[PDB]
Amino acid sequence: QIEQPYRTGYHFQPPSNWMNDPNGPMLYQGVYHFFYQYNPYAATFGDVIIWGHAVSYDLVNWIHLDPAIYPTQEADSKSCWSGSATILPGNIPAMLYTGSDSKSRQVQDLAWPKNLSDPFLREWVKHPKNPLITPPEGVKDDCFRDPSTAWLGPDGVWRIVVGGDRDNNGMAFLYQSTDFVNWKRYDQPLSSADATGTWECPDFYPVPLNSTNGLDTSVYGGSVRHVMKAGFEGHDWYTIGTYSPDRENFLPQNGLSLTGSTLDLRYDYGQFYASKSFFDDAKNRRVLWAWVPETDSQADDIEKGWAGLQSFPRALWIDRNGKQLIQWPVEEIEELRQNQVNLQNKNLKPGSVLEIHGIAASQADVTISFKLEGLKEAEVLDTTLVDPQALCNERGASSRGALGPFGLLAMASKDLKEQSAIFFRVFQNQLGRYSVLMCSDLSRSTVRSNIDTTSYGAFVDIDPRSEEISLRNLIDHSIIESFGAGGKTCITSRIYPKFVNNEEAHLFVFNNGTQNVKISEMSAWSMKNAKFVVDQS
Ligand SMILES: *[C@H]1O[C@H](CO)[C@@H](O[C@@H]2O[C@H](CO)[C@@H](O[C@H]3O[C@H](CO)[C@@H](O)[C@H](O)[C@@H]3O)[C@H](O)[C@H]2NC(C)=O)[C@H](O)[C@H]1NC(C)=O
Ligand SMILES: *[C@@H]1O[C@H](CO)[C@@H](O[C@@H]2O[C@H](CO)[C@@H](O)[C@H](O)[C@H]2NC(C)=O)[C@H](O)[C@H]1NC(C)=O
Ligand SMILES: OC[C@H]1N[C@H](CO)[C@@H](O)[C@@H]1O
The missing domain is CATH 2.115.10.20 (Glycosyl hydrolase domain; family 43)
Incomplete structure (x- = not known):
């Protein structure tokens, strides 16, 4: 206990x-x-x-x-x-x-x-x-x-x-x-x-x-x-x-x-x-x-x-x-x-879930960088007026797309029954220019009743063609500060999974899209x- x-x-x-x-x-x-x-x-x-x-x-x-x-x-x-x-x-x-x-x-x-x-x-x-x-x-x-x-x-x-x-x-x-x-x-x-x-x-x-x-x-x-x-x-x-x-x-x-x-x-x-x-x-x-x-x-x-x-x-x-x-x-x-755990050049095949081992999962600092290949396959969605909060709340971690949802599963149970997902999605407009959306899918963060599990989202201002999508996470039990693209788009989330009362937390990197993505580098430290x-x- x-x-x-x-x-x-x-x-x-x-x-x-x-x-x-x-x-x-x-x-x-x-x-x-x-x-x-x-x-x-x-x-x-x-x-x-x-x-x-x-x-x-x-x-x-x-x-x-x-x-x-x-x-x-x-x-x-x-x-x-x-x-x-x-x-x-x-x-x-x-x-x-x-x-x-x-x-x-x-x-x-x-x-x-x-x-x-x-x-x-x-x-x-x-x-x-x-x-x-x-x-x-x-x-x-x-x-x-x-x-x-x-x-x-x-x-x-x-x-x-x-x-x-x-x-x-x-x-x-x-x-x-x-x-x-x-x-x-x-x-x-x-x-x-x-x-x-x-x-x-x-x-x-x-x-x-x-x-x-x-x-x-x-x-x-x-x-x-x-x-x-x-x-x-x-x-x-x-x-x-x-x-x-x-x-x-x-x-x-x-x-x-x-x-x-x-x-x-x-x-x-x-x-x-x-x-x-x-x-x-x-x-x-x-x-x-x-x-x-x-x-x-x-x-x-x-x-x-x-x-x-x-x-x-x-x-x-x-x-x-x-x-x-x-x-x-x-x-x-x-x-x-304290101690560290790395990963380099690791493909995350469509619909996969890779677990980070050895880290203090419930109190850590996790950086991860994706290398995208095959952008032409990006879904088609002009985002000029789209409100990201609505979009992450409509298309959560379980909504599969072309590029994304791909990212991290933090403050998650061993059976993934409870999980907090911070991820990305890459879209393209009719003219061919791209857009990146960052999400904090708290919909399944906790099974407890009476908790505000609204999700948060925002569009990241970078060029998927030239630069890799980077994401750092400060995981501290009930708060997760998600830093995207080096701080160009930040998202703090509060979560209260039930499992944290008995079992220990887990950490995963994942890709639920249909297109393959690769982990350029993943640095994780136990805090x-x-x-x-x-x-x-
Ligand atoms: C991303 O990939 C999947 C996208 O659907 C998602 O599947 C999960 O499992 C099934 C679909 O295979 C669905 O769960 C159904 O059954 C549960 C019973 O426990 C119901 O409570 C649900 O409402 C639903 O009817 C879900 O769509 C989905 N989530 C779960 C486990 O309920 C994967 O989970 C996604 N990958 C991860 C782990 O984020
Ligand atoms: C004003 O601040 C100084 C600095 O902390 C206080 O001086 C210390 O007082 C304690 C006992 O109260 C002593 O054990 C320390 O040796 C003192 N240090 C110094 C630098 O003198 C001082 O008491 C404070 N005065 C007021 C108004 O309370
Ligand atoms: O939440 C912000 C507000 N709470 C403070 C009082 O606790 C006010 O001064 C401030 O405007």
Whole structure:
């Protein structure tokens, strides 16, 4: 028998209880800081939410600390909601966050470490003039929140954004200040969309063109572009554009307002929400934290007594062609790798299933690369308007085609009665150009009742003719982060097979199509647990 079969081994998550929106991430004095929305009283959202706190020297192995920001003054008596962190000149970190005041309205609060001597910033103090910012003119007291990391303009003035809506038209309210205490709403929003509802946890940063690293938020230039990100309709979206401080104007690259349609871009197309990035000036990389909600019954959450996991921190950067963003787990994860199992030049005959042996199947890192031959045989399906989620949900692992479904069977039982399939499908349009679809077929992930087993999918932007379809998977018990094409298309999935209570998990590579495919290379590593020390009291 096995207890707590769903807690992860190397993904960040508190000892117990509920967690969501990751908060004010930052790198201060050689230490990585992470904060998270926490309900110290149950395994479900509640009327009282504080800021969880934990530190790490490598984003992998953590140390849980006492909660940092909790309601102490009127400006946040009901709860301390999401916010961001900004290290101001002088090496002093500032925390701006949304609070729920006595009158139950959402406002912006400021706070900062109280004992900078302390490597772990255990104790924090609020400013006295809190709240620093209150809902604008025509804005409802529960539609104004999630302030961003601030950025300093060449003119010496700061800039931040706050989420919310104006008559149900999601917006990025922009405020400016010189001291970081007195703020004034700017005349227009930084950006916005219609009928999208409250924009949550906005994020606005610069990405260096033709590079693969990050920049300090405050950077700007002609060889730089800006990502305007926002959550809404249960998903986090973004858009690459150009920023011009002089008029606080954001001009999208594709020239579209966010729509939440299969027309826009998301970081991850599965369970991924309330994401926030931050600049790591030690390794020159922009890191991305994101909340991964549960998919099992609320009843189930109260039983296991915990909800919420954080994605494994991924590095962010704009693509070579500059039209989309790329993500990849930070190198530190590599140090968790134990033993390995390879495969090279292995054909997967039509309708076959090859098992990977010797790996720690339930907690591993698996990369696999397919070599396609005979594309002319691709099914015929113009994909200009097709919605991939519908397609993976209609054509699962058991729907045989020409090229694909071919891929990986993770968190699977020995009898394949329960399985989670991450795979591909290659299609071709009348004119002869190809398209690749990536899927996460959770339809058979678990036999348990009351579990959301919806599947997730997205189209991968590569050329099957020239490049091989690559796929890495971070398998950690109840979460699977599927990285396709080197991070050009990511998909996080939560699954809860029943077998994980008695039997051990299995790992397979498979091809259920009619056309033969070959495994160019398959590198699989068993992943050891991440160290989680506790220093609270
Ligand atoms: C991909 O290849 C097959 C594509 O159909 C798929 O077959 C599985 O087995 C049969 C078809 O041979 C079907 O199962 C039927 O019987 C079960 C009884 O256990 C019913 O519950 C099903 O609803 C259905 O009537 C399924 O179509 C299919 N899946 C299973 C095992 O139920 C293979 O499974 C696919 N390869 C893998 C392992 O992903
Ligand atoms: C401010 O932070 C420092 C650094 O952690 C604290 O100093 C440590 O205090 C413990 C006992 O509380 C000692 O065992 C360590 O030797 C101290 N280290 C240093 C660097 O002095 C200090 O106590 C904190 N002050 C407050 C306000 O609690
Ligand atoms: O826990 C409160 C936070 N949940 C939302 C995102 O899920 C944020 O807008 C809000 O600040």
